[PDB]
């Protein structure tokens, strides 16, 4: 789709009844409401949408443009929807806060550079299938509670969910990655959300079970340039969890749901490209990389805290983000420990540093000004492989890196400055929630003492 | 006083316990109430005579009570990671309780109060988590560097010095300043190394642990 | 729909079998009698129907006549029915019923056109409302309680099955974070889509809809405007077919302002335009307003207490219309998100943002028209946009008193007669007289111990 | 007791091994922390006891507390035998009277009385009734709000088959309002309510007449011999104090609420009143109406002309106005015969009978201010309306904190109710009126949720 035109020739002919006006607020959660599908063609492509902020999570009237590119069929709704996703605007210039106008401001000042014209993002984002998730923070009592039928937990039940009896196959700890059904219990389910997701524009590559046997699972698709990558992973992520819900099961981008197993990380492939050439390969260096490629690396790496202030943003990053997972920033290509990797056109540059519980759009942004300021300051990477750079200890300590350098961030007005304060707040105040809270393992430690 | 509060403590989970309940000194086991602190009330005597009192003054401390209070200050996070070595200890001392390390005697934002045999400084920042043995010697070589060394406090209400936000920064600030309670050889490195080795142990514990408070904020994410 | 004819018309197209004779009461609840279709086109529009309206509260035999273009087929009754509106008149004179609100409302629109002013009134409700999964309240001498509870709300997110005894698979929502992110976040999509549909079905011509700021199963629909009496059959239209769907879905939706404390309530902005001859009265200056739309909201904030009496007239609503961070503030603004009269050419509009839908559309549409009217006529100046801010009732009695002391502006070419202004304080005194007789669980919080 | 001795010797006899260190809040709550009996007697009549107000309701830095041992009596409810002792709240400095105790405001009140020279003595005499119940239960949260009140006397168990014991239902349980006052077994509560009369008559109370009232889910009513204002506080203070803890220690809870079920009677506390000087009676004359003299005329003029701000002391809760309800001592007029009067007239016995006050309130606060009002009245010959357009109570709390701050200055004269008490006790109380402004109530989804 591309034309106002074209959505109206495909509500015809598909019977849509209602439009469901989209898009990601600052944290990354996809915000909505739903409007039928004449008042869509009759308005939104003239005076579009407009919305209030005022309760919208990290906002504070503003207009909603739509982008009929993103736009697809809802395969969950009972009536027949459509979903486009719109980019906020002054009712006219592009809103501050909004992430997705990050990320095409990203792709502009990439090209007025002039070093690439295309910046090709590929996310690895893995997820948890829960069978019941319950949780609790009340004055009296703090809890929170999973369960999964694959769980090796639940390796000695008597009865499952269903009132059937236990006949076993159950995955071991860190033993789910990777064994064919009938161990792997949510192969099927699994199906399900890879055809949902080529049903609605992704084109999909892989699909399997992940190390956590607590039902951990992973889809893999193919890349896209930053801004489309940004919209591929919402979609990605409705999807998913869509699927889950509607399967009364639940799903789940945490970085680290549960303790003694694998952590949830999003692996982000990389590459530049201009006039269709990729620009990442010389076959003359270390891991086939160019001057660019190694320049791109230097420039993620020195910024490499301020980056992980959007790529690891929640408070339960930090217990995946653990020495004992990429922790440490330095590049190679046989490592499985470094935060940088590297696997003509194929050649680019994985930072396993990420996880899903981040606002794509930012997350990709910051890492792609990280990069051009490598490039354009030709900043030298430390070599491949005690003094090497660590990720940052805390949420707290990633924020205060980011604000103490961020100006490759606000290069070209990319991040704004509202923006950048604006997070940080957020963030701050998640710390504070922390600092407030006591934790069960404190019971464990100290309450007899 | 730290057998005495050893014993103090032995009696309240004892007879709490043999009454069918369980009785306990965490800084703060429910969270939105009140915790749980252990304020210290602490002074200097010679030949059977006190020391702090003197008509002369602000709220009648002697030099060598001023300059007590200025050696408690100066050394604060480092006598915090003694009087307050919990990781629940942390959200207690929450700037929402006494953080403020300045010294009134109206104020009750003031971490030090001060409230003539009677004359005395209190010190309202420890919490009962903690070994009484150990946070009764620190604050008293922290005292006694301060009037060893002159050192003038603040005066007594922007600028001012907070304790730490963690007990992660507890412990660095301990492991780098130290001096004032090797002093006499009180407290030797073997038994700061040991201190900081099993306090930076919890706090690998809670870097590991997941919360239900991420639960609440992440999940749906 | 027009004429008899046409309605005998629909009934043979749609095979009508029953026709609901409705009419809204005196508070704001839409009273019936279902009668056969032959019988309806044999006696409605000749000699009305007949009903004994001693029973219905705040009116004591009376006659009925139809409203065809009210009619709409019931999309809930089992049996094929058609519900047509009525207007209550003397049989033996056929004037108007005294406290018939949907009079009041035709009155208004016929008082309106006689001040050459305008002949249009335009209103448009943004009516919000909450889905629970269960309701249940008594008020007995050893007890009295109310119990509401939602799939979505934030204080089941550790609960361990629902109400199916299927497992809590989370995505529920959390204190004032319930606008709006997508499903299954939203456990309420479906529902909400149900009644957009039977609403377009219906008649309504519709915008939007959406969840809520209050997690617990807030919900809004929006739809097209409409002349003053017909925008008030249609919110009375609307509340029905919410009300029905979600019963019918094995739910309970309510229009009460203030159901839960702690997160936000349900309020009902309306939006108001004058028209003449199909032109906009109120573009022109500040705010792209005329000095007809100044002096309009000039003559709502001088009669702002007697206005709400209206607009706000239960006890739960001042539990809504709290300073506790709500439209209070009787002063216009554009960009001011606590005045009580926002500012948002044939879109320049006043956004009255203080009334709740539990109220008589009838009633409420009518009594801001006056007031706006009253300020016209008499070249009533409001205060400067935006210490000494005008305020909102403090109480139901306080609103009560101000309709006691200031009404010559309602019952001007008598759209609001004495009597019915009597009968509205009398019934909701009345109201008052129960809460000032019953005991609260905050008063045992308080006060018991000692 | 009278000196330090006393109470040391008592001590000794009696084998006290704790003293309760008590006062009375602003809101009416007696707070109290417990000291060895040997501290007791080393430090509070030298230099006194001193604690912390921060936390208490309504204080706010440190004050302290000197002792008055003719309030002393032993604790029959205490494992520990524990001697409990009121105490006066004065600077730690300047031992001056502390403004927001209530208690000091009765001493203070009885000593500006004497200043005027009308009397040298108040005399008060509450008629405090309470309801005693098997089990409550309340919770105000997001989702739901309640209470629930249960009783074995309850009329709406008349057809319950189990009992909490698990007894069959044997009848003989009240109607409504039609509690007073048969014989057992109809009332279940004598014997409990004669547990509480025996404790009164240990504590050191002069009994006079106990029974069950109106009520009946379980409402019942001590009376007790009168006494000077501020003792007649100290007294009352006890009074509760004995009765929650006897329905306490009987599994059992009892509660002062002026309306804590609806349909049945309110609960109230009539307060008799009377001025004395030098042994005699000043309210009686022989040759008028009432055998009210004009001392007695004036003051009930006063408490006519300043009943709503009054009614702000003796009626402080919002619980208040479900029991004054016309439906009940609303009409502010004196009568010698007609019950409907606020004020009732029953030779050294005559006295003035206020009928309004309920006991949810501060018995210090209360007594003072309708004896500020009655003097007021005395020294402006204020006449009263003529005995039977007629005002009424307050119609809410928000109405009386309206008046009391407009009419106040009665209360002022003498020192007696400071500015800063006045003003601490009105923003109190309108707090609890906002609160109220943001609950839900289940009659509003009687009414309104359906609409
Ligand atoms: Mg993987
Ligand atoms: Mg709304
Ligand atoms: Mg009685």
Same mark, same amino acid.
């Given at each position: 789709?591309?034309?106002?035109?074209?959505?109206?020739?495909?509500?015809?002919?598909?019977?849509?009844?209602?439009?469901?006006?989209?898009?990601?607020?600052?944290?990354?959660?996809?915000?909505?409401?739903?409007?039928?599908?004449?008042?869509?063609?009759?308005?939104?492509?003239?005076?579009?949408?407009?919305?209030?902020?005022?309760?919208?999570?990290?906002?504070?009237?503003?207009?909603?443009?739509?982008?009929?590119?993103?736009?697809?069929?809802?395969?969950?709704?009972?009536?027949?929807?459509?979903?486009?996703?719109?980019?906020?605007?002054?009712?006219?210039?592009?809103?501050?806060?909004?992430?997705?106008?990050?990320?095409?401001?990203?792709?502009?000042?990439?090209?007025?550079?002039?070093?690439?014209?295309?910046?090709?993002?590929?996310?690895?984002?893995?997820?948890?299938?829960?069978?019941?998730?319950?949780?609790?923070?009340?004055?009296?009592?703090?809890?929170?509670?999973?369960?999964?039928?694959?769980?090796?937990?639940?390796?000695?039940?008597?009865?499952?969910?269903?009132?059937?009896?236990?006949?076993?196959?159950?995955?071991?700890?860190?033993?789910?990655?990777?064994?064919?059904?009938?161990?792997?219990?949510?192969?099927?389910?699994?199906?399900?959300?890879?055809?949902?997701?080529?049903?609605?524009?992704?084109?999909?590559?892989?699909?399997?079970?992940?190390?956590?046997?607590?039902?951990?699972?992973?889809?893999?698709?193919?890349?896209?340039?930053?801004?489309?990558?940004?919209?591929?992973?919402?979609?990605?992520?409705?999807?998913?969890?869509?699927?889950?819900?509607?399967?009364?099961?639940?799903?789940?981008?945490?970085?680290?749901?549960?303790?003694?197993?694998?952590?949830?990380?999003?692996?982000?492939?990389?590459?530049?490209?201009?006039?269709?050439?990729?620009?990442?390969?010389?076959?003359?260096?270390?891991?086939?990389?160019?001057?660019?490629?190694?320049?791109?690396?230097?420039?993620?790496?020195?910024?490499?805290?301020?980056?992980?202030?959007?790529?690891?943003?929640?408070?339960?990053?930090?217990?995946?983000?653990?020495?004992?997972?990429?922790?440490?920033?330095?590049?190679?290509?046989?490592?499985?420990?470094?935060?940088?990797?590297?696997?003509?056109?194929?050649?680019? #540059? $994985?930072?396993? @540093? *990420?996880?899903?519980?981040?606002?794509?759009?930012?997350?990709?942004? %910051?890492?792609? !000004?990280?990069? /051009?300021?490598?490039?354009?300051?030709? #900043? $030298?990477?430390? @070599? *491949?492989?005690?003094?090497?750079?660590?990720?940052?200890?805390?949420? %707290?300590?990633? !924020?205060?890196? /980011?604000?103490?350098?961020?100006?490759?961030?606000?290069?070209?007005?990319?991040?704004?400055?509202?923006?950048?304060?604006?997070?940080?707040?957020?963030?701050?105040?998640?710390?504070?929630?922390?600092?407030?809270?006591?934790?069960?393992?404190?019971?464990?430690?100290?309450?007899?003492? | 006083?730290?057998?005495?509060?050893?014993?103090?403590?032995?009696?309240?989970?004892?007879?709490?316990?043999?009454?069918?309940?369980?009785?306990?000194?965490?800084?703060?086991?429910?969270?939105?109430?009140?915790?749980?602190?252990?304020?210290?009330?602490?002074?200097?005597?010679?030949?059977?005579?006190?020391?702090?009192?003197?008509?002369?003054?602000?709220?009648?401390?002697?030099?060598?009570?001023?300059?007590?209070?200025?050696?408690?200050?100066?050394?604060?996070?480092?006598?915090?990671?003694?009087?307050?070595?919990?990781?629940?200890?942390?959200?207690?001392?929450?700037?929402?309780?006494?953080?403020?390390?300045?010294?009134?005697?109206?104020?009750?934002?003031?971490?030090?109060?001060?409230?003539?045999?009677?004359?005395?400084?209190?010190?309202?920042?420890?919490?009962?988590?903690?070994?009484?043995?150990?946070?009764?010697?620190?604050?008293?070589?922290?005292?006694?560097?301060?009037?060893?060394?002159?050192?003038?406090?603040?005066?007594?209400?922007?600028?001012?010095?907070?304790?730490?936000?963690?007990?992660?920064?507890?412990?660095?600030?301990?492991?780098?300043?130290?001096?004032?309670?090797?002093?006499?050889?009180?407290?030797?490195?073997?038994?700061?190394?040991?201190?900081?080795?099993?306090?930076?142990?919890?706090?690998?514990?809670?870097?590991?642990?997941?919360?239900?408070?991420?639960?609440?904020?992440?999940?749906?994410?």
């Amino acid at each position: 789709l591309e034309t106002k035109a074209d959505a109206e020739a495909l509500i015809n002919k598909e019977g849509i009844e209602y439009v469901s006006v989209r898009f990601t607020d600052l944290i990354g959660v996809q915000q909505h409401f739903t409007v039928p599908a004449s008042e869509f063609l009759k308005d939104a492509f003239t005076d579009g949408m407009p919305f209030d902020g005022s309760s919208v999570e990290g906002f504070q009237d503003m207009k909603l443009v739509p982008d009929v590119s993103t736009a697809f069929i809802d395969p969950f709704r009972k009536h027949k929807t459509l979903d486009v996703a719109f980019s906020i605007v002054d009712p006219d210039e592009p809103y501050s806060r909004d992430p997705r106008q990050v990320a095409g401001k990203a792709e502009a000042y990439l090209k007025s550079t002039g070093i690439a014209d295309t910046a090709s993002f590929a996310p690895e984002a893995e997820f948890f299938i829960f069978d019941k998730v319950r949780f609790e923070n009340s004055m009296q009592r703090s809890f929170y509670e999973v369960d999964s039928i694959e769980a090796p937990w639940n390796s000695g039940i008597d009865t499952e969910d269903d009132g059937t009896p236990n006949i076993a196959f159950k995955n071991r700890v860190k033993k789910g990655y990777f064994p064919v059904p009938p161990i792997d219990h949510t192969q099927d389910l699994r199906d399900d959300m890879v055809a949902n997701l080529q049903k609605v524009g992704l084109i999909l590559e892989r699909s399997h079970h992940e190390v956590a046997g607590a039902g951990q699972q992973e889809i893999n698709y193919r890349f896209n340039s930053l801004q489309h990558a940004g919209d591929d992973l919402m979609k990605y992520k409705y999807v998913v969890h869509e699927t889950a819900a509607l399967a009364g099961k639940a799903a789940t981008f945490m970085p680290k749901p549960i303790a003694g197993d694998n952590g949830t990380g999003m692996h982000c492939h990389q590459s530049l490209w201009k006039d269709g050439k990729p620009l990442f390969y010389d076959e003359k260096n270390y891991g086939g990389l160019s001057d660019l490629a190694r320049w791109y690396i230097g420039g993620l790496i020195k910024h490499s805290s301020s980056v992980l202030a959007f790529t690891n943003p929640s408070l339960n990053s930090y217990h995946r983000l653990v020495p004992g997972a990429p922790v440490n920033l330095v590049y190679s290509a046989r490592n499985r420990s470094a935060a940088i990797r590297i696997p003509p056109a194929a050649k680019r #540059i $994985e930072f396993r @540093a *990420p996880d899903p519980s981040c606002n794509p759009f930012l997350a990709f942004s %910051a890492q792609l !000004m990280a990069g /051009l300021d490598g490039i354009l300051n030709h #900043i $030298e990477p430390p @070599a *491949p492989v005690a003094g090497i750079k660590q990720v940052p200890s805390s949420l %707290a300590e990633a !924020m205060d890196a /980011l604000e103490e350098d961020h100006d490759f961030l606000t290069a070209g007005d990319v991040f704004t400055d509202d923006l950048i304060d604006t997070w940080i707040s957020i963030k701050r105040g998640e710390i504070d929630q922390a600092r407030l809270a006591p934790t069960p393992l404190e019971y464990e430690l100290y309450f007899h003492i | 006083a730290g057998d005495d509060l050893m014993k103090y403590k032995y009696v309240v989970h004892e007879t709490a316990a043999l009454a069918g309940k369980a009785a306990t000194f965490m800084p703060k086991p429910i969270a939105g109430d009140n915790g749980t602190g252990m304020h210290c009330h602490q002074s200097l005597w010679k030949d059977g005579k006190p020391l702090f009192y003197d008509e002369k003054n602000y709220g009648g401390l002697s030099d060598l009570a001023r300059w007590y209070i200025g050696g408690l200050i100066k050394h604060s996070s480092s006598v915090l990671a003694f009087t307050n070595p919990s990781l629940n200890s942390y959200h207690r001392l929450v700037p929402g309780a006494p953080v403020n390390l300045v010294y009134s005697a109206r104020n009750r934002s003031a971490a030090i109060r001060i409230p003539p045999a009677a004359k005395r400084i209190e010190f309202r920042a420890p919490d009962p988590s903690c070994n009484p043995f150990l946070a009764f010697s620190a604050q008293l070589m922290a005292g006694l560097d301060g009037i060893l060394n002159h050192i003038e406090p603040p005066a007594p209400v922007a600028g001012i010095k907070q304790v730490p936000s963690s007990l992660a920064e507890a412990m660095d600030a301990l492991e780098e300043d130290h001096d004032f309670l090797t002093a006499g050889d009180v407290f030797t490195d073997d038994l700061i190394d040991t201190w900081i080795s099993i306090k930076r142990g919890e706090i690998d514990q809670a870097r590991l642990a997941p919360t239900p408070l991420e639960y609440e904020l992440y999940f749906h994410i």
